[model samples]
Target: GIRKLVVLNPRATFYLLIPKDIAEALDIKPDDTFILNMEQKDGDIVLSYKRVKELKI
Candidate 1:
């Protein structure tokens, strides 16, 4: 099991790693936004999403 995941440095732009099969299965696109949530008890992460909406400026 992989226990440690670390980020050396964070930048505005970086490459994202995704499996082709999963991408196709989920119909994921580059423009898709992924929301990440953290569990307070276990500190586990959950991924959720919402439809995009235009904001009136």
Candidate 2:
């Protein structure tokens, strides 16, 4: 499946729309916070995710 990136010119922001199947497979929910890590290896762009948690300092 292919997802599209939505560009909001007025807000100067971009959104990557995740498909329901992929989201469900990853157990993602609305309002879930994710830390995105972008990496380049062997001429390929790799994206990874980590759940964000609050730290009590």
lDDT of each: 0.52, 0.69
Q: Backbone clashes per model, in order?
A: 0, 0
| Each candidate: RMSD | 6.5, 6.2
Q: Tens digit of lDDT per residue, candidate 2, span 1-57?
A: 999864423222656666677788988877777888999999997667667877221
lDDT, candidate 1, 31-55, per-residue tens: 7765544444466643344424352
Candidate 1: list runs displaced more than 4 Å. Answer: 1-16, 40-57
| lDDT top scorer | 2
In model 2, the worst 10-residue window by lDDT is 6-15
Residue pairs whose backbone atoms clash in candidate 1: none
Highest TM-score: which candidate? 2
